[PDB]
């Protein structure tokens, strides 16, 4: 959104494929200025003075509780557990002998609990009342809605052993970045979901310029974004505003640096802290001391590998002992352009290509839909280094990159391996994986 001062002066409003409403005569200098600020193309549309002013004004624990009404608390705890685990849909299904509940987390179904079958009608009744549905009627499908900032869509349906309930959990916030939609696998997302959910420790997202490290951090903060945690951040600059998280901007006009901004944040009694990046030792020292004094710290570095981030902390001047005790994990990340689904050409891989993995892969080609590239959009490929007992020892002993890479390959997949899986799925080309991976 433009500033109100600028929009009111030149008679130009932005309302989102972004539309730019304007009043004639159009100013060419001001039109370029809007393009500069958005960093995105738009569609100019002419409008009369009276309709413009109206557009301007309108613009500016579940598991423990199961062993023990009591149903009201159970369903509320279940919904809280669903949001915790990051479930899209909650499935309550009644069979002959067994009552079963399942979440679908990032497309993958999962068994959460199988309570007593006798509770089946009570769970169906409670969920109906929350969505203003008919309690007595059990022979037809009933659909309703609830607001809890979660907007749940609930659908009942008749079955042979009663009724089957599904609750689709959707966030009303349209600017929510789903970490799985960005490209993380269910296993990578769970492991990263668990890592950022820890009470204390440093987490680093690393990669070169344009690797989507800021976008991944933002999605991580949005997932944690709760009233039970105090989340704050120092940025240079603030990429975009997340509502609920207190975002401080680095300002050289008052000598407000990353280090000085980070110190000020630590006196605000935070739970989670996010530093734009750790460029110098001064900022690194403070981030390490924050992690050892009961704060979860999140930041970034511009290293090519996940192991390079540990070496980078070593080189800046942080003592090995302090790195081992503080570091929870490193997320190496790259972006790969997704193939155009309309014009992607299949081809069988040769012997040299099969060494990396009839193996069918896909090529770029191109058409008018991609115009005329062969790719349309991007997606992330990842390598999540998890600091466990044996990694802590290797950092302390200073085993080096060579010996540390050996152990890391035994447990965590490479960034290329994650990329190659997407080539098999037909999401991106092998050329694009080999481009960004060295």
């Amino acid at each position: 959104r433009l500033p109100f001062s600028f929009a009111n002066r030149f008679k130009m409003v932005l309302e989102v494929p972004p539309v730019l409403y304007y009043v004639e005569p159009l100013n060419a200098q001001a039109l370029v200025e809007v393009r500069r600020v958005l960093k995105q193309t738009f569609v100019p549309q002419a409008i009369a003075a009276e309709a413009f002013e109206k557009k301007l004004t309108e613009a500016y624990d579940f598991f423990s509780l199961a062993e023990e009404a009591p149903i009201i608390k159970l369903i509320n705890a279940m919904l809280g557990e669903a949001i915790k685990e990051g479930a899209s849909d909650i499935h309550i299904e009644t069979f002959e002998k067994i009552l079963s509940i399942r979440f679908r987390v990032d497309g993958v179904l999962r068994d959460v609990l199988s309570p007593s079958r006798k509770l089946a009608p009570l769970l169906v009744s409670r969920v109906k009342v929350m969505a203003k549905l008919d309690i007595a009627e059990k022979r037809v499908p009933q659909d309703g809605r609830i607001s809890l900032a979660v907007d749940v869509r609930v659908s009942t349906m008749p079955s042979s052993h009663g009724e089957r309930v599904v609750m689709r959990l959707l966030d009303k916030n349209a600017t929510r970045l789903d970490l799985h939609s960005l490209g993380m696998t269910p296993v990578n997302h769970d492991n990263f979901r668990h890592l950022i959910s820890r009470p204390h420790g440093i987490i680093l997202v690393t990669g070169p310029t344009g690797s989507g490290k800021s976008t991944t951090l933002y999605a991580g903060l949005q997932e944690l974004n709760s009233n039970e945690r105090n989340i704050l951040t120092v940025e240079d600059p603030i990429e975009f505003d997340i509502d609920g998280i207190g975002q401080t901007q680095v300002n050289p006009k008052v000598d407000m640096t990353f280090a000085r901004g980070l110190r000020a944040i630590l006196r605000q009694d935070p739970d989670v802290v996010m530093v734009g990046e750790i460029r110098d030792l001064e900022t690194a020292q403070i981030a390490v001391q924050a992690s050892l004094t009961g704060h979860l710290v999140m930041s970034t570095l511009h290293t090519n590998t996940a192991v390079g981030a540990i070496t980078r902390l070593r080189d800046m001047g942080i003592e090995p002992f302090l790195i081992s005790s503080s570091l929870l994990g490193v997320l190496a990340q790259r972006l790969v352009r997704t193939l155009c689904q309309d014009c992607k050409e299949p081809y069988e891989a040769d012997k040299e290509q099969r060494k990396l993995f009839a193996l069918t892969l896909y090529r770029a080609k191109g058409c008018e839909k991609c115009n005329h590239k062969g790719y349309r959009g991007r997606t992330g490929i990842h390598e999540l280094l998890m600091v466990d007992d044996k990694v802590q020892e290797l950092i302390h002993a200073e085993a080096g990159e060579q010996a540390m890479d050996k152990y890391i390959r035994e447990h965590t997949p490479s960034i290329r391996s994650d990329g190659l899986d997407k080539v098999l799925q037909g999401v991106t080309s092998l050329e694009e994986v080999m481009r960004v991976t060295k």
């Binding site: 433009l2 500033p3 001062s5 600028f6 002066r9 159009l26 060419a28 200098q29 001001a30 039109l31 370029v32 200025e33 809007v34 393009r35 500069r36 600020v37 960093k39 193309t41 738009f42 569609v43 100019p44 990669g207 070169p208 310029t209 344009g210 690797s211 240079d236 600059p237 006009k253 511009h302 790259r334 972006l335 352009r337 991007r378 481009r435 960004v436 060295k438």
Partner: protein, 224 residues
Amino acid sequence: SEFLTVRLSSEQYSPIPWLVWSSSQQEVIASGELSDWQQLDDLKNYAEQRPIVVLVAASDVVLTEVDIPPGASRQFESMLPYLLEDEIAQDVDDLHFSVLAKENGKAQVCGVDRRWLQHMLDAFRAQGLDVKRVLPDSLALPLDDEGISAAQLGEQWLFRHSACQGSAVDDSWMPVYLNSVACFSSLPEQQAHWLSRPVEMTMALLSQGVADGKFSLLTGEFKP
């Protein structure tokens, strides 16, 4: 004699055209395109021992004219952000300004986001690449006596209005923006008097202008 010209923009997902021009031979020695900012390491091989000139996209830059208050030419640059404060669509403290020219009672200004310019220089410094100059891509186009010089680069139309004034606009709303144009590329299906000039590769055309001109946004705080 030889130098590498690199065309960057605010969009990190967008391509980065580059070209090695030779003023000694008047020829294109090497040419290519990075897909993302993730390939900045690939520029090492093409740079070797050659000056690097960065062409920032004119879309990511404010090029405008302002009146110098009478008898305040010596203190003008300090007053520059406040005079343009109403005419830009963000906090003017964020921008880094460079005076291109001072003539009569007016001054030619070029503004760019400070953090972006610093971040671009830090990206090249991390790769061992030393950026010698930074200027708007549009101002590297040649001046024509018969009209506004134009050239298409990617899915954008570069326009140089005068010596210090310029712009870059997307194809989709290029015709609406213009409301004679000497064009150094294939003429579009748009627009308003388009004079066809001999066609050249845009990055090669820009590189020839880079060799002629002395403009640079590496001024004040950003001086080497």
